[PDB]
Design a protein around this ligand. Sequence first.
Ligand code: CLA
Ligand code: CLA
Ligand code: CLA
Ligand code: CLA
Ligand code: CLA
Ligand code: CLA
Ligand SMILES: CCCCCCCCCCCCCCCC(=O)OC[C@H](COP(=O)(O)OC[C@@H](O)CO)OC(=O)CCCCCCCCCCCCCCC
Ligand SMILES: CC1=C(/C=C/C(C)=C/C=C/C(C)=C/C=C/C=C(C)/C=C/C=C(C)/C=C/C2=C(C)CCCC2(C)C)C(C)(C)CCC1
Ligand code: SF4
Ligand code: SF4
Ligand code: SF4
Ligand SMILES: [Cl-]
Lengths: 68, 73, 81, 73, 141, 72, 143, 751
Amino acid sequence: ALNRGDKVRIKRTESYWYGDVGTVASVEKSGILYPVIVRFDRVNYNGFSGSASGVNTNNFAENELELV
Amino acid sequence: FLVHHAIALGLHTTALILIKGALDARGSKLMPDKKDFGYSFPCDGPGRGGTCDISAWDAFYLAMFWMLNTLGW
Amino acid sequence: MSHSVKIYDTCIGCTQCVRACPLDVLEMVPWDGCKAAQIASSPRTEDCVGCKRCETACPTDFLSIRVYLGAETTRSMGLAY
Amino acid sequence: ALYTHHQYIAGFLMVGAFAHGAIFFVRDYDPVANKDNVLARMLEHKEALISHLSWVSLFLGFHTLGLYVHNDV
Amino acid sequence: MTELSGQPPKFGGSTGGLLSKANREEKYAITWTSASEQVFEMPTGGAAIMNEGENLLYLARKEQCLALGTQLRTKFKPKIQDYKIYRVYPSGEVQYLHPADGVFPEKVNEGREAQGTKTRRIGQNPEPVTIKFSGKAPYEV
Amino acid sequence: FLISWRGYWQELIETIVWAHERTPLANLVRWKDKPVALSIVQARLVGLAHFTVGYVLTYAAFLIASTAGKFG
Amino acid sequence: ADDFANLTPCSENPAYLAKSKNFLNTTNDPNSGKIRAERYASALCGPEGYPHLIVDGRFTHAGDFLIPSILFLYIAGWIGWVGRSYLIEIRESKNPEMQEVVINVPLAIKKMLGGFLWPLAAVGEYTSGKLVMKDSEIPTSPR
Amino acid sequence: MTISPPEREAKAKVSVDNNPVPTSFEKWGKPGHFDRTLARGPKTTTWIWNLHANAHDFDSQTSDLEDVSRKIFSAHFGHLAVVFVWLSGMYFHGAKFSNYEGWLADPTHIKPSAQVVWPIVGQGILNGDVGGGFHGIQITSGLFYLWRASGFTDSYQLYCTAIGGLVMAALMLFAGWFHYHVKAPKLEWFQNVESMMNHHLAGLLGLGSLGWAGHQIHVSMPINKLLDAGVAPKDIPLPHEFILEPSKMAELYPSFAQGLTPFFTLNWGVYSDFLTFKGGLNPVTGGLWLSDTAHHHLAIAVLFIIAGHMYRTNWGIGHSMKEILEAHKGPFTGEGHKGLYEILTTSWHAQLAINLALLGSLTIIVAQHMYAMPPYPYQAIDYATQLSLFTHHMWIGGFLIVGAGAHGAIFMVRDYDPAKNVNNLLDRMLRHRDAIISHLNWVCIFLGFHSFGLYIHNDTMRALGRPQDMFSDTAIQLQPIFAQWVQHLHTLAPGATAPNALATASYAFGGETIAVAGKVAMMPITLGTADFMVHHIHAFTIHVTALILLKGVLYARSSRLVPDKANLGFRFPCDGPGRGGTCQVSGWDHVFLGLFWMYNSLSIVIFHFSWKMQSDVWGTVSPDGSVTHVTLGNFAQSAITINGWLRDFLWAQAANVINSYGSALSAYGIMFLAGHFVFAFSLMFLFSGRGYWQELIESIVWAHNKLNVAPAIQPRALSIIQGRAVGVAHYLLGGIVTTWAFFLARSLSIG
Ligand code: CLA
Ligand code: CLA
Ligand code: CLA
Ligand code: CLA
Ligand code: CLA
Ligand code: CLA
Ligand SMILES: CCCCCCCCCCCCCCCC(=O)OC[C@H](COP(=O)(O)OC[C@@H](O)CO)OC(=O)CCCCCCCCCCCCCCC
Ligand SMILES: CC1=C(/C=C/C(C)=C/C=C/C(C)=C/C=C/C=C(C)/C=C/C=C(C)/C=C/C2=C(C)CCCC2(C)C)C(C)(C)CCC1
Ligand code: SF4
Ligand code: SF4
Ligand code: SF4
Ligand SMILES: [Cl-]
């Protein structure tokens, strides 16, 4: 039910963006565990010490998102 | 008056360290699985920004300095 | 002895952990859970030192490869003597 | 000597109390049985607690140090 | 495993090489074929000269052999992706270590059995209180 | 122990291990346990222990000696 | 009638007078010490002769902490409010970070100027929803 | 296409690019342009700190060695511009905000003062009365002494010097702009090391001391001879009046009657009127003889100009440095220096390490030479000036040395090629670094036990009431026998091994007690058991600093623990908690530890200097000749125990800094407390770790999210390396400011 450009709130407890909202970029074909690719405005902690920024994309399952 | 506010600062900062350590011991965003790593562990590596003194044991160890400072005052 | 290196189902099969590992602890094996059709594996954790290069490398929202340091051996302590 | 002795003992005891609270959260805390009670609700708003402890520590530190340094100068 | 061949690299000696562990406990060997006599960085300090043809080198640790292997495959004009790494015991027993099934682990390969696999996310590990008084941690179940 | 962390000491201990294994007469003797640098947590704990012992003893000697020499 | 009996007004303390007849000049004016000996005489001093302040809340010492508290809280509310509105406005400018390191001086000065009504704007954002955000719409860490 | 001059190649080894970099202001408005990783955009606050950490890291910015060399050249120009601005400000403050003329008229009964504080919030108390109705801050830089030695008399001369310094700064700035943007010399130009060295030895050093010898003979010496006779600065003719009237020069030095003929005809002896070799100090002022210094600078000009000829450039005669290097190889070192000429011509960090090491050593030499052979007038009377200059040059040298270790490690990481270093010095040192470092470690342990251990033994013996069991001149003596012998040899040099020297090179080696005014200028400095112990403490601390830094350089490539450390870079936090934990293995971290240990060493050095000079040197001489020293000769019995240093040195001499309130020296007590504070502050960064602070930032950021004030540039805790950099910077700053306040207050209070 998730389409490109949908604003979804993250429900993954261990996710950096739990409670935050990200935009849906693509939904991969069936057979995959976590297909919904989500892009976020806020970078997470990813990177070696001293790195400038981090990752702003991650895959999720649909039930792990909440439609905004 | 001045030393009593120094004492209040010391109590509050030692309590802040200890309580932040206890409330984040199960997990934070740097370590959402910290409860799997036990109370005491070295760190989580230099990745994810660097994770020196991440365990709640480290929070105890840091708070010890503030307790000694408070008692000095 | 050795450390423990677990690979979870959020694996996207980018293999960066295997390339980062400086002791050949990890491999890529065929899988069907991700688009890359591959999952990381730790069949040689007895050589694992625990430097955490794999975790530094992992891109998934919180690591899909996790190193829990355990019982210390001369191989795990990086000892040459 | 007795005052200093007992105060230092008290400081060690307080630090150990909070350290073992952290050890509880790490090893023994059960979320399903403690669900929604006061214990779990303390974790539920832990960011508020930690942030307001930070604020009171900053308040006290800034202003007590400021008055002391004003008097010194 | 059998016997190991190769010529020792041209080198005058270092203090960074093998110690008593090599004879008492374990050692490691790396073989590689070079196209010419070329200089390379010795992982134990200094510059050594590899010979055209086969080269066998004994090092103290597996990580040293793997660092030399990455240097061989990343820093040389015709890249050397031919190196094999073995664990050598003082009993003479030789154990082939790298690359496991003849293929570098960075790329997938059939006939590989997944190990360390967990059929869940990190956030789906059980609570330690649910496993206390066993000997296990939430990642071991 | 607080300021200087572990890897530097492990490398120094490796130089010392080499120095022992290559010094004759001393070579007759070998360690039953491989010498290694103190762990990270061990370092924190040992540094805090020295910090606290010095803290308490310094202040105790000062308090006692000042109050006894002055007699209140 | 007999409150604060451990303090006496500086005009009545002999130590304060003996020290104020030697008060050091503060600026280029050679009467700044006399101006101090005049001004501080109205407050309460003590045995050492140094003026003591009363933050008790009673209005006879309203100038000791009440008026300065009002002044500071006004200025700090202005500062925080204009900075926050600058941040909020910038957030929807496609690239807020670059405008946070490289200041948007027109917008910045505009927000700073409109800071004299900061308590009114604070109450107005509270009564709506611009001041406080809802907890389930805020990122948190695992419990 | 900016301002284009003709050519100016002079048919030389010059080769420039006409206009490689155009001038524009747009990259000013894009902070982070020089780094690709920062030109994208700041997402976290780390981007901010990185923007300052990689500003001068020109290697990581571009791969063109030529562009890096041009950047370094123009940055050298800008740096000289900054130093010229600083020196011009010094001369301007001496001209228009100092009592230099009042001091010149009566140096003994006045104190050197510049910088007038503005009377506000009570800070006007800092304008202490320095003499002659002047109120300000007393300066310990010793600018007035250098100016009297130069021959200054009027404030307008200092003002002209300041204007000229501003003009020279503008010149250097324009030169940097012009040589990076317009005419930018190619890489081939910088690699003429023979040409550069010939010029620096001949033109920079030789011609410099030649011109300064000219100025000293023509301006400094006559004005100083007239000042030492008491002619008063208002009556002494201007410096040029001696050039316009050679009779005025002949009346002071009759040698000037015979003209330049003794020079051209090698009749140098008649030049004895101003080219002398006396040796000792001026009786009237306590400084060095300006004729001795003029003759010295003359001979130094001669030596350096001659030395500027050994190397070969365009005319065949000279030396190829590559040849001299490749020739030197013995049976212990394989190929010796084969390949060193190549790395010392393509690596900037190699030259930088060598030059930092030698310059730090030279500044330490400068401190140790200027204290015992006071070259300026009335310098030794001012114990504050003496101590201040000594400790300052000490600290500068130590910092330059730590930087030398740093850039040796950087070279090893970045510019080391094993193919270009096969069986040479570098290769074999890397091949036996385990031997080197293990033996240095053993020497460090032996020194710690046999220096500080002696102090601990003496503390324990004295506490037990066993003074006869102590190490001291009155018990178990440890006499510095060799240093005493060398002092005696120095004392006997004039007239014997130094025939043409009238007096000893420095009266610290022995002889009479030269005293100017009520104070002692310089006298013999005896050496005993306490001096033995302090000197071996110095040896121990210097060896430990060297151990740390040399280990950092030799293992920056690899170790048995981390065999691929070269790939990790010069500066990185660790390589994980694995292998037992690998924290601080980088070369950068070795520099970080060496900073603390150099601080330790130099603190002990300057404490030794201060106490020894206050106990056994400085003091008041009587009309009878009795010498009452500052602290009554207490060094020999107190400096042998740690409790002695805590009580009679620190606690005793700290009495001035703590009681400085309500007086002109109150800023010193304020900065004392301030240094203590910053030192304590640093311990938070050094004792903790980034993870706690980031997790606390998480809750603070949640509170920001609650009221919608969260910033787009996400707050991130300081990186591991940055945490340590902040820690060490604040540690050094706090401690050094503490001892700066301590020394200045103590030395200014003792008159
Ligand atoms: C004298 C040493 C020192 C000082 C000044 C501090 C300061 C602080 N610590 Mg800390 N700490 C120290 C030693 C010190 N620590 C040591 C040795 C350890 C053991 C490693 C710790 C471990 C520790 C922990 C674990 C924590 C603290 C916390 C805090 C903060 C508490 C809030 C407060 O004090 O109010 C206000 C702050 C201050 C008064 C300090 C700032 C003072 C400056 C001068 C204010 C003016 C700014 C200045 C002008 C900037 C301009 C710079 C420019 C001129 C160059 C505070 C900033 C707690 C915290 O983070 O609070 C939320 C906390 O969690 N400390
Ligand atoms: C109107 C004068 C002018 C202009 C507009 C430029 C323009 C430019 N220069 Mg240039 N340059 C100038 C003067 C100027 N320069 C001078 C006087 C020198 C001699 C020092 C140089 C030497 C030089 C070098 C070596 C380099 C440049 C570079 C650059 C480009 C990078 C942008 C930048 O500098 O970031 C912004 C810079 C600032 C905001 C400067 C802030 C002040 C700094 C941090 C310290 C100030 C020290 C000061 C220069 C020393 C004297 C001051 C003293 C008198 C008080 C840029 C287009 C760099 C380049 O090629 O880019 C890749 C480069 O490597 N310039
Ligand atoms: C006799 C010729 C000569 C002289 C005087 C110098 C002098 C200098 N060089 Mg240079 N050099 C030379 C030849 C010379 N060089 C040649 C032939 C080469 C090519 C191989 C180089 C390549 C070279 C490089 C790569 C660098 C230098 C640098 C420097 C400066 C660093 C030393 C310093 O800071 O001291 C103190 C500084 C001063 C006292 C400044 C005053 C000197 C002014 C600027 C020049 C003298 C004026 C002129 C000769 C007329 C006045 C004298 C006359 C009235 C009698 C210095 C001013 C470094 C630099 O750029 O520094 C900024 C640097 O990186 N040199
Ligand atoms: C154990 C041997 C040894 C020792 C003790 C030294 C020590 C010293 N050298 Mg030397 N060097 C050596 C080997 C050694 N070097 C060899 C073998 C070479 C041949 C490659 C060089 C060539 C070299 C040059 C060209 C220069 C030095 C200079 C210096 C002095 C710098 C002082 C300073 O930094 O203050 C301040 C610095 C200056 C006054 C001048 C700075 C000159 C620039 C900035 C540094 C050199 C640039 C470099 C050659 C660029 C090319 C390298 C690469 C990019 C191609 C110093 C005392 C400098 C000097 O002035 O000599 C007296 C200098 O010009 N060295
Ligand atoms: C001729 C001397 C010289 C030269 C040109 C260089 C050149 C270089 N160094 Mg080096 N170094 C030197 C001396 C020198 N250094 C000294 C004396 C030390 C010992 C402290 C070091 C130790 C050292 C380390 C550990 C590192 C470098 C690094 C670097 C590179 C980055 C420059 C930089 O730091 O960015 C910009 C500069 C700064 C951000 C400095 C600002 C912070 C300073 C320290 C605060 C000091 C405060 C002030 C002095 C007193 C307090 C007042 C305050 C309240 C205002 C650069 C190519 C870095 C590198 O990556 O190498 C490639 C790095 O890791 N150097
Ligand atoms: C007072 C504080 C202190 C002390 C005593 C030491 C001690 C030492 N440091 Mg250290 N260090 C310190 C502060 C201190 N550090 C700090 C704050 C830092 C952070 C920057 C460092 C970081 C640092 C580094 C990076 C290094 C050292 C090194 C060394 C060792 C030098 C070798 C030596 O001196 O021989 C031995 C001296 C002693 C053991 C001192 C005590 C000796 C007493 C007088 C004798 C005791 C008698 C007997 C044994 C008592 C037994 C009791 C009985 C009940 C059994 C030494 C053991 C260097 C090293 O390892 O050199 C080889 C080195 O690499 N330190
Ligand atoms: C009071 C002084 C005490 C020291 C005396 C004992 C010296 C200790 C080492 C003996 C050999 C070194 C002397 C010959 C100097 C020498 O070069 O010998 C010759 C030999 C190399 O010479 P080559 O024949 O190769 O000469 C060709 C050169 O051009 C090489 O490039 O050196 C070595 O064998 C390597 C070992 C030297 C490293 C040993 C130094 C150990 C540090 C000891 C520090 C003592 C402090 C001295 C106070 C300043
Ligand atoms: C004034 C007065 C009064 C009153 C009093 C009161 C009422 C009080 C109270 C008090 C109090 C009330 C106090 C307190 C304190 C507290 C604390 C000190 C805390 C704590 C805790 C801890 C330390 C820990 C915790 C934990 C954790 C961490 C987790 C888990 C769980 C636990 C618990 C373990 C009267 C009228 C009587 C009389 C007159 C006077
Ligand atoms: S430096 Fe920090 S992250 Fe690195 S190993 Fe040490 S504690 Fe862990
Ligand atoms: S922790 Fe280090 S050794 Fe272990 S698998 Fe990861 S990269 Fe390899
Ligand atoms: S780095 Fe992480 S996501 Fe990528 S293959 Fe390895 S375990 Fe899977
Ligand atoms: Cl004593």
